[PDB]
Design a protein around this ligand. Sequence first.
Ligand SMILES: *[C@@H]1O[C@H](CO)[C@@H](O)[C@H](O)[C@H]1NC(C)=O
Ligand SMILES: *[C@@H]1O[C@H](CO)[C@@H](O)[C@H](O)[C@H]1NC(C)=O
Ligand SMILES: *[C@@H]1O[C@H](CO)[C@@H](O)[C@H](O)[C@H]1NC(C)=O
Ligand SMILES: *[C@@H]1O[C@H](CO)[C@@H](O)[C@H](O)[C@H]1NC(C)=O
Ligand SMILES: *[C@@H]1O[C@H](CO)[C@@H](O)[C@H](O)[C@H]1NC(C)=O
Ligand SMILES: *[C@@H]1O[C@H](CO)[C@@H](O)[C@H](O)[C@H]1NC(C)=O
Ligand SMILES: *[C@@H]1O[C@H](CO)[C@@H](O)[C@H](O)[C@H]1NC(C)=O
Ligand SMILES: *[C@@H]1O[C@H](CO)[C@@H](O)[C@H](O)[C@H]1NC(C)=O
Ligand SMILES: *[C@@H]1O[C@H](CO)[C@@H](O)[C@H](O)[C@H]1NC(C)=O
Ligand SMILES: *[C@@H]1O[C@H](CO)[C@@H](O)[C@H](O)[C@H]1NC(C)=O
Ligand SMILES: *[C@@H]1O[C@H](CO)[C@@H](O)[C@H](O)[C@H]1NC(C)=O
Ligand SMILES: *[C@@H]1O[C@H](CO)[C@@H](O)[C@H](O)[C@H]1NC(C)=O
Lengths: 283, 283, 283
Amino acid sequence: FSKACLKNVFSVLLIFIYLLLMAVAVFLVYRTITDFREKLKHPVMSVSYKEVDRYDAPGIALYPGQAQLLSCKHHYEVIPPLTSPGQPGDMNCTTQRINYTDPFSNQTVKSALIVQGPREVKKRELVFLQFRLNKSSEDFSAIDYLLFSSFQEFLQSPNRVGFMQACESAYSSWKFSGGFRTWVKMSLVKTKEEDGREAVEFRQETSVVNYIDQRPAAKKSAQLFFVVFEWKDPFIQKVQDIVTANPWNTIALLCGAFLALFKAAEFAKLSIKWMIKIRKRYL
Amino acid sequence: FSKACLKNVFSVLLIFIYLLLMAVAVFLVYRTITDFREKLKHPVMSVSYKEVDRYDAPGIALYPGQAQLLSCKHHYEVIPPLTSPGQPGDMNCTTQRINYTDPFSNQTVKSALIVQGPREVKKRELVFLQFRLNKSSEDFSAIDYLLFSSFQEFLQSPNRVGFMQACESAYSSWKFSGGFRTWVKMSLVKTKEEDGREAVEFRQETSVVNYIDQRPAAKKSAQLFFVVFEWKDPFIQKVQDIVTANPWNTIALLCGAFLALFKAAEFAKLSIKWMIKIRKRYL
Amino acid sequence: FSKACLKNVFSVLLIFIYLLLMAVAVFLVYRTITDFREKLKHPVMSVSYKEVDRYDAPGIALYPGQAQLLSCKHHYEVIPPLTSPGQPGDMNCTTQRINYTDPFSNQTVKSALIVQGPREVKKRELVFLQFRLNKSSEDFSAIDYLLFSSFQEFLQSPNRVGFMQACESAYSSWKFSGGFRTWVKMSLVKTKEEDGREAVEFRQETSVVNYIDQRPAAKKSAQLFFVVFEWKDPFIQKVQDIVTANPWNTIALLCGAFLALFKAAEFAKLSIKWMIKIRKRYL
Ligand SMILES: *[C@@H]1O[C@H](CO)[C@@H](O)[C@H](O)[C@H]1NC(C)=O
Ligand SMILES: *[C@@H]1O[C@H](CO)[C@@H](O)[C@H](O)[C@H]1NC(C)=O
Ligand SMILES: *[C@@H]1O[C@H](CO)[C@@H](O)[C@H](O)[C@H]1NC(C)=O
Ligand SMILES: *[C@@H]1O[C@H](CO)[C@@H](O)[C@H](O)[C@H]1NC(C)=O
Ligand SMILES: *[C@@H]1O[C@H](CO)[C@@H](O)[C@H](O)[C@H]1NC(C)=O
Ligand SMILES: *[C@@H]1O[C@H](CO)[C@@H](O)[C@H](O)[C@H]1NC(C)=O
Ligand SMILES: *[C@@H]1O[C@H](CO)[C@@H](O)[C@H](O)[C@H]1NC(C)=O
Ligand SMILES: *[C@@H]1O[C@H](CO)[C@@H](O)[C@H](O)[C@H]1NC(C)=O
Ligand SMILES: *[C@@H]1O[C@H](CO)[C@@H](O)[C@H](O)[C@H]1NC(C)=O
Ligand SMILES: *[C@@H]1O[C@H](CO)[C@@H](O)[C@H](O)[C@H]1NC(C)=O
Ligand SMILES: *[C@@H]1O[C@H](CO)[C@@H](O)[C@H](O)[C@H]1NC(C)=O
Ligand SMILES: *[C@@H]1O[C@H](CO)[C@@H](O)[C@H](O)[C@H]1NC(C)=O
């Protein structure tokens, strides 16, 4: 009746209390393990993928030098035929300009043009950029570009100079050539270091397409650069410490270890009792 | 004797029965967990690789437009020197032609030429294709291609039109340029969605090689396209829900949780008995 | 006092002995499982990443044929402007030459030039190579290259001929074109087979940049090849058998299975005692 129900309730709450205590002990051991692992250098890391409905707009830092940005536009899955190559027109995108001292030599000041990238991967959104360089005594006509995760973070950055140097430290620098159109499909990788900081890196796939110049031969001295930026897939890659990335495996291992210790203690007590009984029976 | 053996057999079969019951309960809990997980959106997914002796022949959907397929051939690890570039000859491969309305605009009807790809990765099998385009008023001379997993599935597809649209929805579209030879190394990725459907995607690595035209200057108006398709490695990538991909980790976690619950119940019973005995001894 | 301390010490050492025995049994079962898995063909494999402070210098096997290696140099993050393209000069790197019969046809003897690659990824170390080919009646001007893990291993190899054939068996062969500069970012993948042997493979990302030739028109007959080699990131990928790569998950599963078996045995004994008591009470 009432007494049996009260006893059952007391037993259930005591079970819950002991479960809470066991969870606390297991969590403390896991916290100790993670604290030890965080101070290791070069640990083994695991990989995971996560799908996104829409991407945060990335930042494309271009280094045209003397080349003038002729045109930048947003398109969906297709680029309409060029109205007049080599002519300025239709320049309407979110762009910023930043000068910063190169972190590797300190002799050269890099001037970068930051462009907001595309967001809608599931609609094949494209950012199409056209540059024109009048003349250059240098060989290997190319424009260098760099990719970073967020344009908004750069916009609200307190420094905006150390941000660009930190971006240059990342391994996301490439070049695209003149006289060609480069289709770039970018992929996002995020690595979680033991300090808690996130390092963002970009993979790329490229398609290089020759450009046919029907402009007059007198106008062929200038060089035209065409580049297209889009997201390859809605999957973001995440590299994280193998123990920290999957806490549940370590929790299961620790629970098994504790239960094994309890079992071993019970067997030791049983063996002690057995030996005591054997000694008593013998003498 | 007989009685002891019978008792031992009964105990062993009872142990097996209880093990079956525990396995049934653990499987039911795992099934409930997976049913909950399947209705989540954008979960964390794990990656695995599997080696294959031979590949299923893929489907290469090319969009030449006005370009004529001059030649297609299968080679092993090397391509013999061209007998006569720009001339038709040696066109012998499994090819099919399909017209379908583009799923993104519905104004344009895409005409695709499907080619059966290579299978023997361990023999470096190559599919070599040569196209020729007489003239084109458009710039950016390129031919678009798409990759899908199985040519046989397309061959036996009941629709053959929705199949191509679904393939176009996948993120496996690229282009290759004229006046160059493009060596394409493809890699296969298969993603298992929670609905049970498999999404197939292709990664690519490209080598672009300039083509030297020794044909007469009067014949240089036409543009030549050369493309090579082969498998990069015998490893197929598989991306799957992290809980579903490794059921054994979840099984171990659930077994540990159940044993912890049993241990907690035993400790609660022991504590109840201890307190009852203490109360009896005190008064 | 002394007796209680001695009893506690004996109990603790017996607990340790039983824990050692349980660990031995679990390790034996895991060893049996791994021995069974090692004889499987095409198993499921997991992936992990490991960071490195510095890379072991790789081996770049180039196949110039009739092209002469004009220049090879080591640079950090930037290549100074060319003093005089097409002219020999500044050839100072660790290079070796090897002839070996091709393992696929045995009719052709491949002559390879091995170059020691870069090591310091965190300093963006670059290996820059320039070749010059006087004339060639063949089309598709390209130079084939292959990548292998260690130059030192090739240097101390007892055979040096079977080593190159085994390297050619690996899926790390590409080409780079003349009249262009190819920036190659390489990534290292190591696969552990069940036999214990390690297979090394290379991924690559390429940037192709057009080269502007201001040399006199009489000197344009020769073709110039420019290639740059560097490491993309300090992360090495490792693909290994899923059971062997994460032994701790299997250890946790086996510990849970053993504890479940012990629990089932205890429940069977309790049920046997219950039924015996019920039979005694009834009659
Ligand atoms: C495009 O440019 C025009 C003028 O250059 C501007 O008024 C318009 O807002 C721009 N649209 C977008 C989407 O950038
Ligand atoms: C940045 O440097 C460029 C020259 O490279 C020049 O426009 C000026 O010095 C700087 N621009 C601004 C807006 O500070
Ligand atoms: C360049 O200047 C920066 C900041 O003053 C310094 O940290 C770096 O060591 C310098 N590099 C040299 C002197 O090579
Ligand atoms: C530089 O480019 C402009 C295009 O904005 C062109 O009008 C001008 O003629 C070019 N300079 C020379 C010297 O041709
Ligand atoms: C190659 O083509 C010829 C005729 O064009 C045909 O008879 C032969 O069967 C073809 N072989 C292959 C392997 O496609
Ligand atoms: C497909 O379209 C092409 C024109 O693009 C033309 O051959 C014809 O209309 C269609 N071919 C077939 C076989 O239905
Ligand atoms: C194109 O037509 C298809 C099928 O009729 C339709 O689903 C799609 O919304 C249309 N797109 C438009 C009207 O932009
Ligand atoms: C079109 O290509 C064919 C090759 O099949 C060639 O004979 C013909 O002359 C070309 N057309 C023109 C107008 O040159
Ligand atoms: C560069 O070459 C010169 C002579 O060609 C040689 O003396 C020097 O040791 C070389 N340095 C390096 C770093 O290879
Ligand atoms: C290797 O072959 C080349 C010709 O391809 C020639 O130098 C010679 O036969 C061999 N060289 C050496 C050093 O054995
Ligand atoms: C080429 O020679 C090698 C070694 O003698 C042999 O293993 C291979 O089968 C040969 N290939 C042929 C005859 O096609
Ligand atoms: C071959 O190349 C050399 C450069 O070392 C050059 O001097 C020579 O003239 C070339 N041969 C011919 C036939 O031009």
